[PDB]
Design a protein around this ligand. Structure first.
Ligand SMILES: CCCCCCCCCCCCCCCCCC(=O)OC[C@H](CO[C@@H]1O[C@H](CO[C@H]2O[C@H](CO)[C@H](O)[C@H](O)[C@H]2O)[C@H](O)[C@H](O)[C@H]1O)OC(=O)CCCCCCCCCCCCCCCCC
Ligand code: CLA
Ligand code: CLA
Ligand code: CLA
Ligand code: CLA
Ligand code: CLA
Ligand code: CLA
Ligand code: CLA
Ligand SMILES: CC1=C(C#C\C(C)=C/C=C/C(C)=C/C=C/C=C(C)/C=C/C=C(\C)C#CC2=C(C)C[C@@H](O)CC2(C)C)C(C)(C)C[C@H](O)C1
Ligand SMILES: CC1=C(C#C/C(C)=C/C=C/C(C)=C/C=C/C=C(C)/C=C/C=C(C)/C=C/C2=C(C)CCCC2(C)C)C(C)(C)C[C@H](O)C1
Ligand SMILES: CCCCCCCCCCCCO[C@H]1O[C@H](CO)[C@@H](O[C@H]2O[C@H](CO)[C@@H](O)[C@H](O)[C@H]2O)[C@H](O)[C@H]1O
Lengths: 172, 90, 173, 189
């Protein structure tokens, strides 16, 4: 049995197709050493944070909140222009969100990523649940790559992604 | 060697479960987890408010806000006790 | 079992009803933290000091001792306190009450061992507790008047703070 | 329940394409079927019910108050408040409390006493969220003894419904002010 992402390598032993974002991709063998369910939970959280971040690196260029209308459209400047009080409130809200994740991860045996946030019940249909389960991990990985790109491009150009594109400032 | 003395009423509080027993809270062993959490939130608000009044410190600070600023470190122990009582069935 | 004062709340575990004025009123759960005998000593001491303070405020509105009116002028209620730190009344009273409260500290140390009833200094020179029902009636009346005197002293002093008149000067107009 | 299975409870579906969560039971006063966004899964049900009841009761006291405040004023309020009303008054009360005027301290008195009451009845919420014998909204407050039997049931339904209605009313009575000023009957007429 061979890996389907890398067809000349053997299939990794500790990842199976039941995991939603499976593609048989583990050339460095991370799943052979570390706890696979932990690595799934961590991948899901990194991807979700990058989904929110990839939307939020782009969205203030379309429009800003009226109280933050004077804030820069460069994300790396608007990070600093927010005062310590607003970032402290954001950190407190993130901590409220992470209390459930702490309880679930260190004291529970739920599925990876399951914090019990399904108000619309969009996973009730089985095929729909499978498609959303795979698609969350796919768009999460895509947003990880995209947010990495946007952050280092914003380091180089000191402007947002849309702004950097339309001025065509592509060379450092 | 010789018997090591302790004050009267010292019990064994060594724990390997999810949470310690309520005896580690001493006199607060009978306070419910909801009361601890509410007192932690209230202490956090009062301590932060009083501290924010006394960050521009003068040579005549208000004594009441000085006392109330000590509720800011108190809320940490309060939410730890809230977690302890919540996982103790209280 | 629900509390009698607060019917939508559970009865406190450390309140049995054996004490005078126990109707089960403890929503914040203070009796779970402190010893109930220590708390009853605190309540009785606060109430007795407040009874004496209320009676003193009423009497010092009613009349003054000979010579006090030159020392204090027209600065009745708490305004005399500072003035009498400049004189020697407050220090003398603090010393003698500190003596009495050292002996009260010994009495509290005996209360905490289960060998003394709460608030019991056995001070009955004029015998009134001649019957065990009159004793319970006087205990209930003492604790109720102590709580009433706590809030009455609060009202008199804070109204004096607002107006500068006094408890009975206010009712004159 | 009052008219269980007809007015509330089992079987009734409010949004046919967005079914309410199955965790949402059918023996809570006011269940018609209306939870299209599934928001009952994101919080404790006791907290949600008691929060709805408290929001509703505050809105009921506000709507009744709004109408009367726009109609009948206590003697001597004209010397402090004057021709102002509603959302301004609160603010300028604080301004009066900021100015130094020792007789405009009404809103501080009410915040003191309502906060004291909320602090003292907070443990009722705390045993309520542990499945205790107290139901959300039950403070056992019936001085006149009118709901002492089955008559309670009907009242419960009607109360929670009026609460929701009151929740709408204040918003109009506030937001219609924030564009124009005036008051409920000054904006009606
Ligand atoms: C930094 C963080 C600071 C945050 C400050 C928050 C303050 C709020 C306190 C939270 C509630 C505490 C409840 C309480 O106390 O709990 C109630 C307890 C009663 O506990 C009873 O205590 C009994 C034994 O204690 C008693 O017995 C001892 C021997 O007699 C003591 O002397 C005294 O009588 C009393 O403590 C047993 O433990 C019983 O189980 C219990 O019922 O009160 C006591 O213990 C009475 C003495 C403790 C009073 C607490 C205030 C002390 C503050 C210290 C600073 C002021 C110091 C004044 C000194 C002058 C200025 C320098
Ligand atoms: C990783 C996430 C992340 C982080 C750290 C930030 C950080 C920041 N944002 Mg930003 N933002 C994000 C995501 C993020 N954003 C997303 C996803 C959007 C699109 C909605 C925006 C839209 C946005 C605007 C329009 C503005 C900011 C601004 C800011 C800055 C000030 C803080 C603030 O008000 O935040 C605001 C952040 C939000 C409103 C995002 C909240 C998203 C929540 C958490 C997700 C909700 C999930 C779900 C839909 C809830 C409903 C459930 C229900 C259906 C059942 C700060 C640098 C302001 C600024 O300084 O501009 C220069 C500003 O004006 N953000
Ligand atoms: C709303 C529910 C409710 C009800 C029905 C009661 C009922 C009662 N309380 Mg009570 N109480 C309540 C809430 C309530 N409480 C709350 C939220 C607190 C603050 C934590 C208290 C604090 C409290 C204290 C400190 C005391 C009582 C006492 C009493 C009893 C004397 C009745 C009296 O004088 O009425 C008049 C009561 C008031 C004006 C205050 C309560 C205001 C509520 C909203 C009105 C309820 C009045 C009630 C229907 C009258 C009962 C009818 C009849 C039995 C007389 C009575 C059994 C006394 C007692 O004997 O217990 C030791 C007492 O000393 N209560
Ligand atoms: C701590 C309280 C206090 C203070 C500050 C004073 C202060 C004073 N008393 Mg006095 N006194 C007090 C309690 C106090 N007394 C008590 C408790 C009694 C017992 C009833 C007396 C009985 C008393 C008498 C009998 C007289 C004074 C007098 C005086 C004044 C002497 C100067 C003068 O007028 O001649 C002096 C200012 C004398 C005086 O003329 O005062 C008008 C005077 O003859 N005092
Ligand atoms: C029995 C013991 C005793 C003794 C020896 C004293 C001694 C004294 N007390 Mg005194 N006191 C006592 C018990 C005692 N007290 C008790 C039990 C109380 C009640 C708790 C007080 C309450 C008290 C007050 C309120 C005042 C004194 C004052 C005084 C002083 C009077 C100064 C002066 O010129 O005298 C002259 C006295 C005369 C009668 C001649 C006129 C003096 C040091 C006064 C003071 O400090 O004066 C400066 C004062 O204001 N004492
Ligand atoms: C509301 C008043 C009141 C009542 C009913 C009681 C009741 C009681 N006390 Mg008590 N006490 C009080 C106030 C009161 N106390 C105050 C203010 C103090 C501080 C000085 C004390 C200090 C005290 C001690 C140290 C002890 C008691 C004890 C007792 C118990 C024994 C029976 C007894 O003597 O009661 C009978 C009480 C009365 C008949 C009340 C007397 C009311 C007087 C006559 C009125 C005085 C008028 C006033 C001075 C003038 C006002 C002037 C105006 C201008 C305002 C009993 C439960 C003893 C105990 O628990 O163990 C057995 C004990 O050891 N008490
Ligand atoms: C949500 C409550 C609410 C709020 C925040 C306000 C806000 C205000 N009112 Mg108004 N008012 C209300 C309801 C409210 N109103 C109701 C329900 C009435 C009776 C119809 C009134 C009648 C009223 C008059 C006549 C006046 C005010 C005035 C005022 C202003 C000064 C504050 C003051 O003195 O209040 C006073 C408020 C009251 C006297 C209402 C108390 C009625 C309570 C809520 C009944 C509760 C009974 C119930 C058994 C308690 C249960 C306790 C527990 C079990 C929950 C301020 C803008 C004054 C003003 O500036 O006018 C221009 C003024 O003159 N109020
Ligand atoms: C319970 C409701 C209530 C009642 C019965 C009264 C009754 C009264 N008020 Mg009044 N008042 C109320 C609420 C109420 N007020 C409220 C909510 C406020 C705003 C905080 C005021 C502010 C107010 C002022 C500023 C004055 C009065 C005054 C008066 C008295 C004469 C009326 C007048 O001159 O005009 C009258 C006894 C006047 C007064 O003191 O006359 C004796 C006066 O100057 N009132
Ligand atoms: C939970 C769920 C729901 C939810 C909903 C919530 C809101 C979920 C939202 C999920 C959202 C956040 C998905 C966002 C994905 C964006 C990713 C894929 C992209 C990055 C773009 C990359 C490719 C790039 C870029 C590139 C950069 C690097 C450089 C540039 O030169 C070029 C370019 C621009 C191309 C709700 C709440 C309704 C409840 C329901 O019961 C369940
Ligand atoms: C000597 C001196 C001074 C002094 C001083 C003095 C003498 C100060 C004395 C202060 C006192 C005695 C304050 C009392 C406050 C009572 C309160 C808050 C009651 C609350 C009741 C509550 C919360 C609820 C009650 C209730 C209600 C209605 C509803 C719920 C149930 C219930 C519990 C029954 C200085 C330092 C100022 C300076 C001066 O130069 C010298
Ligand atoms: C979800 C992600 C959460 C993580 C972020 C939460 C922590 C917040 C970090 C600090 C945020 C703002 O803090 C910040 O304050 C000042 C402005 O307000 C900054 O001050 C300066 O910062 C930069 C210097 O490197 C400059 O480009 C800024 O123009 C300048 O304001 C401080 O250098 C910084 O500490």
């Amino acid at each position: 049995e061979m890996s389907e992402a890398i067809p000349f390598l053997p299939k990794p032993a500790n990842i199976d197709a039941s995991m939603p974002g499976y593609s048989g991709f583990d050339p460095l063998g991370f799943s052979d050493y570390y706890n696979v369910k932990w690595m799934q939970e961590a991948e899901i959280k990194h991807g979700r944070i990058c989904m929110l971040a990839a939307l939020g690196m782009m969205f203030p260029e379309f429009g800003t909140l009226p109280q933050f209308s004077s804030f820069s459209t460069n994300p790396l400047e608007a990070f600093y222009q927010v005062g310590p009080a607003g970032w402290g409130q954001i950190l407190l809200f993130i901590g409220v969100l992470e209390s459930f994740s702490y309880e679930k991860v260190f004291y529970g045996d739920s599925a990876p990523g399951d914090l019990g946030f399904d108000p619309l019940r969009m996973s009730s249909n089985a095929a729909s649940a499978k498609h959303y389960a795979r698609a969350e991990v796919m768009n999460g990985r895509l947003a990880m790559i995209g947010f990495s790109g946007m952050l280092h491009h914003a380091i180089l150009t000191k402007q947002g992604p849309i702004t950097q594109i339309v001025e065509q400032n592509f060379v450092p | 060697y010789s018997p090591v003395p302790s004050p009267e009423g010292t019990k064994e509080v060594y724990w390997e479960t999810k949470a310690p027993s309520s005896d580690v809270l001493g006199i607060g062993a009978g306070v419910s987890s909801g009361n601890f959490a509410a007192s932690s939130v209230v202490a956090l608000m009062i301590g932060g408010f009083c501290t924010g009044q006394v960050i521009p410190l003068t040579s005549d600070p208000n004594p009441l806000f000085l006392i109330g600023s000590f509720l800011l470190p108190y809320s940490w122990a309060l939410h730890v006790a809230a977690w302890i009582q919540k996982n103790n069935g209280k | 079992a629900m509390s009698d004062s607060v019917p939508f709340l559970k009865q406190p575990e450390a309140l049995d009803g054996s004490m005078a004025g126990d109707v089960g009123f403890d929503p914040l759960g203070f009796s779970s933290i402190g010893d109930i005998n220590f708390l009853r000593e605190a309540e009785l001491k606060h109430g007795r000091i407040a009874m004496l303070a209320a009676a003193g405020s009423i009497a010092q509105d009613i009349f003054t001792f000979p010579g006090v009116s030159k020392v204090v002028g027209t600065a009745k209620m708490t305004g005399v306190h500072d003035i009498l730190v400049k004189q020697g009344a407050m220090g003398q009273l603090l010393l003698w009450l500190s003596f009495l409260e050292v002996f009260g500290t010994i009495a509290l140390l005996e209360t905490l061992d289960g060998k003394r009833a709460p608030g019991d200094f056995k001070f009955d020179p004029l015998n009134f507790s001649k019957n065990p029902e009159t004793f319970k009636r006087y205990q209930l009346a003492e604790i109720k008047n102590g709580r009433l005197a706590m809030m009455g002293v609060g009202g008199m002093v804070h109204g004096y703070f607002i107006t500068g008149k006094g408890p009975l000067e206010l009712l004159g107009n | 329940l009052y008219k269980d299975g007809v007015m509330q409870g089992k079987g009734l579906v409010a949004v046919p394409f967005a079914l309410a969560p199955d965790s949402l039971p059918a023996d809570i006063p006011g269940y018609v079927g209306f939870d299209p966004l599934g928001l009952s899964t994101l919080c404790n049900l006791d907290f949600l019910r008691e929060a709805e009841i408290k929001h509703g009761r505050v809105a009921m006291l506000a709507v009744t108050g709004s109408l009367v405040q726009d109609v009948f004023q206590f003697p001597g309020v004209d010397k402090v408040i004057g021709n102002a009303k509603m959302i301004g008054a609160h603010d300028k009360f604080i301004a009066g409390a900021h100015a130094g005027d020792t007789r405009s301290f009404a809103m501080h008195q009410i915040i003191f006493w309502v906060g004291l009451l909320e602090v003292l009845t907070m443990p009722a919420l705390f045993e309520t969220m542990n499945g205790g014998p107290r139901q959300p909204g039950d403070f056992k407050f019936d001085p006149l003894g009118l709901g002492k039997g089955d008559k309670l049931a009907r009242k419960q339904l009607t109360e929670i419904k009026n609460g929701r209605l009151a929740m709408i009313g204040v918003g109009g009575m506030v937001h219609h002010y924030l564009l124009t000023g005036k008051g409920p009957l000054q904006f009606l007429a």
